[PDB]
C-alpha cells in the first residue's frame, strides 16, 4: 500500500532514508562503492548530531524562554504551540501523505521544464506544505483547493531555494545546497525588502555592527563563545532562575555556539566529493545546469550570527508580541528555535546586526499578527487531530500559523480581510519580486 | 554547614565548577582575564558535549544490549545494575560527602610528600572510592575500616594516574592530564600482565590487528566511522530489532565514533593555553617537575579504537558471563558503555585488537566472577539506600562491584575466602608491580 511504503519511508528517518538516496546517487555516478558508503554515513551522522544539539536547545533554552513569557504578565491568552505542535497536527490531516508524492511531482515537472535548480530530497519538511493545504481545506472546503495549496506552496519554496542559493553557498558555506523549507526561507523575502529599503536611505545605509566588530574591540570577551554565555545568563535571569541554573544554562547556550557548527560539518564533509564527480559528469550533458540539493533549514543554525540573533530575540519576540497591535498570541514553543525565523535575514544583511534587528521586529510582528488571524483555523486542525482537550482553549502557532504563504492563500480564496490581503500581499509580493531580481544579477555576475 | 556547601559545590556541576577552578587558576598564573575566561567556557562546552554523546550511547546502544542479555534471563538471575545504579546507591552512604575532603587531603598529603603528581579535580568520581569504603563498612562493620578503604582506593588511583600517564598522553592526546578514576584505570594493571605473557610467548608476540592495518586492507570500509556502522547493524540484529531499527541504530553507533572525539577537543583546547603558562612560571620553582590534572575517564572514549572495543565487547561480555565459572551476574547496565572497562588495555597493547581481546576476556571474567562474590553487600547497599523491595531480588554490578580493589580490601579485612584473596591479589599484585616498572622505565627513557 502507498500509505505503508510512505509511512515506512517517513519513519525510516533522515538517519536512514537520506543516506540511501545519497548512496544510490553515487553508485550510479561511477563512484567506488566504498566511497559512496562513506558519505552516506556522514550525512546521517550529521543529522544524528543535528537532532542532538537541537535537542539541547529545546530542553534548556526552551524551558527558560517559556519561563520569560510567563514571568512577563501580559494579556496574551493564546499560547504559541510552536512547530513541535503544528507538525503533529498537520501530519494528522487527510492530505498529509498524499502531499509528499504531489510535492515531488511539482519538483519533477519544474525540473524538466528548467523552472528550478533545486532537487529537493527532504521529504520531512513537506508538513509546511500540508499546513497550507490543511488550513485551505478548512476554510474553503474543496479537497482540490487544499491540494492546489500544496502545489503553490511546493513551487514557491522550490524557487526560494534558487533565489537564496548564493546566500546559502557564500554566507553559510553550503556549496550545492539550497534551503527551501521552513521559516528561514519563506521569511527571507521580507528581509530582502528591508535591506533594499535601507540601502537607498543615506546615513542609515552606513550604519554597521557585525559580530566581528565586537571581537575587534573586546577580544576574548567579544568572541561568539563568550556572547553565548552572557546572553544565556540573561535568559536565565529574566526567567527568575537561581544563580546555579543561570550559570548552568549559560554554558549550554554557549555550547550551542561551538557544537552546532561542528555537527553540520559531517554533511558538508560527505557531500563534497559527490558534487565534484557529478559536476564533472553533468556539465557535459545538461549544459552547465548547476543543480541544488534541498535540505532542512537546520543546517542554517551553524552560523554564529544566527545563534546570536536567536538568543537575542528570545526576549525581543516577547516584547514584539506585546507591542504589535492586534496580536493575541504569546511567544512560546518557537522561542527556543527562534533563530530559524531570522536566519536568511542575517544572510541578506551579510552580518549587519543593525539591519538584522530592524528586520526581526518586522518579521516577528507580521508573523505574530498573522498567527493571530489564523487562530480559528489552527484550532480546527487541533480538533481534527484530537489535540487540545476539553478546555476548548484557542490554539495558535508562529511556525506555519504565522506563515505569509498559508495566510495570503487563505485570504485570497475567502476574501475576509481585503485590507489585510492588500497590505500583506503588497509587502510580501514586493519582497518576492526583489528576491527574484537579486538572483538575476547574481547569475549574470558569476557567469561573466 | 559543610553538607550544604558540599552539595552546592557538587550540584553546581562539572560544567560550572571546573571552569571556576580553571578560571581562578589562570588568574593565579597572572594569565589574561579574557584569556582566563575563554579557557573555562570551552571546558564547560566540552562537558556539555560529553553528556550528549554519552547519552546517545546509553539510550541507543543501551536498550540494544539490554535486549541481547535478556535472552539469558533464565540462567543468570542477578542483573548488573551498572554504574547508572551503583553511583546513586553509593551517594546515599554515610561516608559520601565526608569522602570529598578525605580524598582531597590524601591528594594534598601525597602531593606535598612528593608521592604523586596527580592534582585530581574530579570530585564526582570520588564515588568509586566510597563504594570500596561502603562495602568494607557493610562487611566489616567498622566505620574506621570504611574510611581506610577510601584512602587506600584514593592512594591507589592517585598512583594509577602517574603510572598510566604516558598512555593518556602518547596514546590519547591528553597531555598534562591523568585518568585516575574509572573502571578503566584500576583494571589497567591486568592488561599489563596479559601483554607481558604474550610478548614472552614466541609467535603470539608477532600478531598485529590494528586500526591502521584495518584501513589499508579494506579501505574506506576499514575507517572508524564505517566500522561503527557495521557493528551497529550487528548490535541491532542481535537484539532482535527490526531491519529499520538496526539501520537507525547503526548510524547512531557510528555517529558516536565521529562526534565524541569532537566534543572532548574543547576541553583540550581550553586546558592547553593554561598548561604552557603553568610550565613557564612553575618550572624552576618546583624543581622542573611536570604535574598532571586528573579528569574523567570519558575523555578516553574519544579514541576511535576504544569505541570499537565498546561495541565488540557488548556480545563478548555477555557470552563471557555464560561460561565464567561461578558467575550469577547478568551484564546489563554497564553494556551501553562497556569500553570503560578495557580503555587502558587499548593503550597498553598499542591498539592491538588481538591482545585487546585476550585481555578483554580476562578482565570481564574476573570482574563478573568478583561481582558474583559481592552480591550480598551490593544488595545491602541498596537496602540501606532504599532501592529494595521484599522480593528477595539481589543487586550486583560489574562497575565497582566486580572491582578487585573493593574485593581485595573486603577480603583482606574479613578473610572470608582466603583462596580468593590469594588468587586475585597475586594476579593483581604481579600486575601492579609490572605497572610500576612501566613508569620507572618510561621516566628513565625521558631522561635519556
Ligand atoms: C512589485 C510587484 C508585486 C505587487 C503586489 C501587489 C499586491 C496587491 C494586492 C493584492 C490583494 C488585492 C485584493 C483585491 C480585492 C478586490 C475586491 C473584491 O473582490 O471585493 C470583494 C469584497 O466583498 C469588497 O468589499
Ligand atoms: C507548476 C507545476 C505544476 C505541476 C502540477 C502537479 C499537480 C499534481 C500532481 C500529481 C501528483 C499525484 C500524486
Ligand atoms: C494536472 C492533473 C491534475 C490532477 C492530478 C491528480 C490529482 C492530484 C492528487 C491526487 C489526490 C486525489 C485523491
Ligand atoms: C474530490 C476529489 C478532488 C480532487 C482534486 C484534485 C486536484 C489536483 C490538482 C489541481 C491542479 C494542480 C495545480
Ligand atoms: C598515604 C596516604 C596519605 C596519608 C594521609 C591520609 C589522610 C587521611 C585523611 C583524613 C582521615 C580522617 C577521617 C575523619 C573521619
Ligand atoms: C596503599 C596505601 C596504604 C596506606 C594508606 C593510609 C590508610 C590509613 C590512613 C588514614 C585514615 C585512618 C582512619 C581514620 C578513621 C577515623 C574513624 C573515626 O573517626 O571514627 C570515630 C567514630 O566514633 C566511629 O563511629
Coordinates of N, CA and C in Angstrom, one line a residue, chain A residues 305-423:
Chain A
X305 N 26.3 34.2 13.9 CA 25.4 35.4 13.9 C 24.0 34.9 14.0
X306 N 23.6 33.8 13.4 CA 22.2 33.3 13.5 C 21.9 33.0 15.0
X307 N 22.8 32.2 15.6 CA 22.6 31.9 17.0 C 22.6 33.1 17.9
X308 N 23.4 34.1 17.6 CA 23.4 35.3 18.4 C 22.1 36.0 18.2
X309 N 21.5 36.1 17.0 CA 20.2 36.7 16.8 C 19.1 35.8 17.5
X310 N 19.3 34.5 17.6 CA 18.3 33.6 18.2 C 18.2 33.9 19.7
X311 N 19.3 33.8 20.4 CA 19.3 34.1 21.8 C 18.9 35.6 22.1
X312 N 19.3 36.5 21.2 CA 19.0 37.9 21.4 C 17.5 38.1 21.3
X313 N 16.8 37.5 20.3 CA 15.4 37.7 20.0 C 14.5 36.9 20.9
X314 N 15.0 36.1 21.8 CA 14.1 35.4 22.8 C 13.4 36.4 23.7
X315 N 14.0 37.4 24.3 CA 13.3 38.5 24.9 C 12.6 39.4 24.0
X316 N 13.2 39.7 22.9 CA 12.6 40.7 21.9 C 11.3 40.2 21.4
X317 N 11.1 39.0 21.1 CA 9.9 38.5 20.5 C 8.8 38.6 21.5
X318 N 9.1 38.3 22.8 CA 8.0 38.5 23.8 C 7.6 40.0 23.9
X319 N 8.6 40.9 23.7 CA 8.3 42.3 23.6 C 7.6 42.7 22.3
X320 N 8.0 42.1 21.2 CA 7.3 42.3 19.9 C 5.9 41.9 20.0
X321 N 5.6 40.8 20.8 CA 4.3 40.3 20.9 C 3.4 41.3 21.6
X322 N 3.9 42.0 22.7 CA 3.1 43.0 23.4 C 2.8 44.2 22.5
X323 N 3.9 44.7 21.9 CA 3.8 46.0 21.2 C 2.9 45.8 20.0
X324 N 3.1 44.8 19.2 CA 2.4 44.5 17.9 C 0.9 44.7 18.0
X325 N 0.3 45.8 17.5 CA -1.1 46.0 17.6 C -1.9 44.9 16.9
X326 N -2.9 44.3 17.6 CA -3.7 43.3 17.1 C -3.3 41.9 17.4
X327 N -2.1 41.7 18.0 CA -1.6 40.4 18.4 C -2.4 39.9 19.6
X328 N -2.7 38.6 19.6 CA -3.3 37.9 20.8 C -2.5 36.7 21.1
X329 N -1.4 36.5 20.5 CA -0.6 35.2 20.6 C 0.7 35.5 21.4
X330 N 1.0 34.7 22.4 CA 2.1 34.8 23.3 C 3.2 33.9 22.7
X331 N 4.4 34.4 22.5 CA 5.5 33.5 22.0 C 5.8 32.4 23.0
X332 N 6.0 31.2 22.5 CA 6.3 30.1 23.4 C 7.1 29.0 22.7
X333 N 6.4 28.0 22.1 CA 7.0 26.8 21.6 C 8.1 27.1 20.5
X334 N 8.1 28.2 19.9 CA 9.0 28.6 18.9 C 10.1 29.6 19.4
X335 N 10.1 29.8 20.7 CA 11.1 30.8 21.2 C 12.5 30.2 21.3
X336 N 12.6 28.9 21.6 CA 13.9 28.3 21.7 C 14.6 28.2 20.3
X337 N 13.8 27.7 19.3 CA 14.3 27.6 18.0 C 13.9 28.8 17.1
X338 N 14.0 30.0 17.7 CA 13.6 31.2 17.0 C 14.6 31.8 16.1
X339 N 15.9 31.3 16.1 CA 16.9 31.6 15.1 C 16.5 31.1 13.7
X340 N 15.6 30.2 13.7 CA 15.1 29.7 12.4 C 14.4 30.9 11.6
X341 N 13.7 31.7 12.3 CA 12.9 32.8 11.7 C 13.8 33.8 11.0
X342 N 14.8 34.3 11.7 CA 15.6 35.5 11.3 C 16.9 35.0 10.6
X343 N 16.9 33.7 10.1 CA 18.1 33.1 9.6 C 18.6 33.8 8.3
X344 N 17.9 33.7 7.2 CA 18.3 34.3 5.9 C 18.3 35.8 6.0
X345 N 17.6 36.3 7.1 CA 17.7 37.8 7.3 C 19.1 38.2 7.6
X346 N 19.9 37.4 8.3 CA 21.3 37.6 8.6 C 22.1 37.5 7.3
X347 N 21.7 36.5 6.4 CA 22.5 36.3 5.2 C 22.3 37.5 4.2
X348 N 21.0 38.1 4.2 CA 20.8 39.2 3.3 C 21.6 40.4 3.7
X349 N 21.5 40.8 5.0 CA 22.3 41.9 5.5 C 23.8 41.6 5.6
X350 N 24.2 40.3 5.4 CA 25.6 39.9 5.4 C 26.3 40.1 6.7
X351 N 25.6 40.2 7.8 CA 26.2 40.2 9.1 C 25.8 41.5 9.9
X352 N 25.4 42.5 9.3 CA 25.0 43.8 10.0 C 23.9 43.5 11.0
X353 N 24.2 43.5 12.3 CA 23.2 43.2 13.3 C 22.2 44.4 13.3
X354 N 22.6 45.6 13.0 CA 21.7 46.7 12.9 C 20.5 46.4 12.0
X355 N 20.7 46.0 10.8 CA 19.6 45.6 9.9 C 18.9 44.3 10.3
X356 N 19.7 43.4 11.0 CA 19.1 42.2 11.5 C 18.0 42.6 12.5
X357 N 18.3 43.5 13.4 CA 17.3 43.8 14.4 C 16.1 44.5 13.9
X358 N 16.3 45.4 12.9 CA 15.2 46.0 12.2 C 14.3 45.0 11.5
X359 N 15.0 44.1 10.8 CA 14.3 43.0 10.1 C 13.5 42.1 11.0
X360 N 14.1 41.8 12.1 CA 13.5 40.8 13.0 C 12.2 41.3 13.6
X361 N 12.1 42.6 14.0 CA 10.9 43.1 14.5 C 9.8 43.1 13.5
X362 N 10.1 43.5 12.2 CA 9.1 43.4 11.1 C 8.7 42.0 10.9
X363 N 9.6 41.0 10.9 CA 9.3 39.6 10.7 C 8.4 39.1 11.9
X364 N 8.8 39.4 13.1 CA 8.0 38.8 14.2 C 6.6 39.4 14.4
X365 N 6.5 40.8 14.2 CA 5.2 41.4 14.3 C 4.2 40.8 13.3
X366 N 4.7 40.7 12.1 CA 3.9 40.2 11.0 C 3.4 38.8 11.3
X367 N 4.4 37.9 11.6 CA 4.0 36.5 11.9 C 3.2 36.5 13.2
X368 N 3.4 37.4 14.2 CA 2.6 37.4 15.4 C 1.2 37.9 15.0
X369 N 1.1 38.9 14.1 CA -0.2 39.4 13.7 C -0.9 38.3 12.8
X370 N -0.2 37.7 11.9 CA -0.8 36.7 11.0 C -1.3 35.5 11.8
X371 N -0.4 35.0 12.7 CA -0.8 33.8 13.6 C -2.1 34.2 14.4
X372 N -2.2 35.5 14.7 CA -3.5 35.9 15.4 C -4.7 35.8 14.5
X373 N -4.5 36.0 13.2 CA -5.6 35.9 12.2 C -5.9 34.4 11.9
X374 N -5.0 33.5 12.2 CA -5.2 32.1 11.9 C -5.6 31.2 13.1
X375 N -6.0 31.9 14.2 CA -6.3 31.1 15.5 C -7.4 30.2 15.3
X376 N -8.5 30.7 14.5 CA -9.6 29.8 14.3 C -9.3 28.6 13.5
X377 N -8.6 28.7 12.3 CA -8.2 27.6 11.5 C -7.3 26.7 12.3
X378 N -6.3 27.2 13.0 CA -5.4 26.4 13.7 C -6.0 25.5 14.7
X379 N -7.1 26.0 15.4 CA -7.8 25.3 16.4 C -8.6 24.1 15.8
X380 N -9.1 24.3 14.6 CA -9.9 23.2 14.0 C -8.9 22.0 13.6
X381 N -7.7 22.4 13.1 CA -6.7 21.3 12.8 C -6.3 20.6 14.1
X382 N -6.3 21.3 15.3 CA -6.1 20.7 16.6 C -7.3 19.8 17.0
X383 N -8.5 20.3 16.7 CA -9.7 19.4 17.0 C -9.7 18.2 16.0
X384 N -9.3 18.5 14.8 CA -9.2 17.4 13.7 C -8.0 16.5 13.9
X385 N -7.4 16.6 15.1 CA -6.3 15.7 15.5 C -6.5 15.2 16.9
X386 N -7.6 15.5 17.6 CA -7.7 15.2 19.0 C -6.6 15.8 19.8
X387 N -6.2 17.0 19.5 CA -5.0 17.6 20.1 C -5.3 18.3 21.4
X388 N -6.2 19.4 21.4 CA -6.5 20.1 22.6 C -7.7 19.6 23.3
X389 N -7.7 19.6 24.6 CA -8.6 18.9 25.5 C -9.9 19.6 25.7
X390 N -10.6 19.2 26.7 CA -12.0 19.7 26.9 C -12.0 21.2 27.4
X391 N -10.8 21.8 27.5 CA -10.8 23.2 27.9 C -11.3 24.1 26.7
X392 N -11.2 23.6 25.5 CA -11.6 24.5 24.4 C -10.6 25.7 24.2
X393 N -9.4 25.6 24.8 CA -8.5 26.8 24.7 C -8.1 27.0 23.3
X394 N -8.0 28.2 22.9 CA -7.6 28.6 21.5 C -6.2 28.1 21.2
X395 N -5.9 27.6 20.0 CA -4.6 27.1 19.6 C -4.1 28.0 18.5
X396 N -2.9 28.5 18.7 CA -2.2 29.3 17.7 C -0.7 28.9 17.7
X397 N -0.1 29.2 16.5 CA 1.3 28.8 16.4 C 2.0 29.9 15.5
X398 N 3.3 30.1 15.7 CA 4.1 31.0 14.9 C 4.7 30.4 13.7
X399 N 5.1 29.1 13.8 CA 5.6 28.4 12.6 C 4.4 27.8 11.9
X400 N 4.3 28.2 10.6 CA 3.2 27.9 9.7 C 1.9 28.5 10.0
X401 N 1.6 28.7 11.3 CA 0.5 29.5 11.7 C 0.6 31.0 11.3
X402 N 1.8 31.5 11.5 CA 2.1 32.9 11.1 C 2.7 33.0 9.8
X403 N 2.5 32.0 8.9 CA 3.0 31.9 7.6 C 2.4 32.9 6.7
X404 N 3.1 33.8 6.0 CA 2.5 34.6 4.9 C 2.0 33.7 3.8
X405 N 2.6 32.6 3.5 CA 2.1 31.7 2.4 C 0.7 31.2 2.8
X406 N 0.6 30.5 3.9 CA -0.7 29.9 4.3 C -1.7 31.0 4.5
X407 N -1.3 32.2 5.1 CA -2.3 33.3 5.2 C -2.7 33.8 3.9
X408 N -1.8 34.3 3.1 CA -2.2 35.0 1.9 C -3.0 34.1 0.9
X409 N -2.7 32.8 0.9 CA -3.6 31.9 0.1 C -5.0 31.9 0.7
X410 N -5.1 31.7 2.0 CA -6.4 31.7 2.6 C -7.2 32.9 2.4
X411 N -6.6 34.1 2.6 CA -7.3 35.4 2.4 C -7.6 35.7 1.0
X412 N -7.1 34.9 0.0 CA -7.4 35.1 -1.4 C -8.7 34.3 -1.7
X413 N -8.8 33.0 -1.3 CA -9.9 32.2 -1.7 C -11.1 32.5 -0.8
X414 N -11.0 33.2 0.2 CA -12.1 33.5 1.1 C -12.5 35.0 1.1
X415 N -11.6 35.9 0.9 CA -11.9 37.4 0.9 C -12.6 37.8 2.2
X416 N -11.9 37.6 3.3 CA -12.4 38.1 4.6 C -11.8 39.5 4.9
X417 N -10.5 39.6 5.0 CA -9.8 40.8 5.3 C -9.1 41.3 4.1
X418 N -9.9 42.0 3.2 CA -9.4 42.5 2.0 C -8.2 43.5 2.3
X419 N -8.5 44.4 3.3 CA -7.4 45.3 3.7 C -6.2 44.5 4.1
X420 N -6.4 43.4 4.8 CA -5.3 42.5 5.2 C -4.6 41.9 4.1
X421 N -5.4 41.5 3.0 CA -4.8 40.9 1.8 C -3.9 42.0 1.1
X422 N -4.4 43.2 1.0 CA -3.7 44.2 0.2 C -2.4 44.6 0.9
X423 N -2.5 44.9 2.2 CA -1.3 45.3 2.9 C -0.2 44.2 3.0

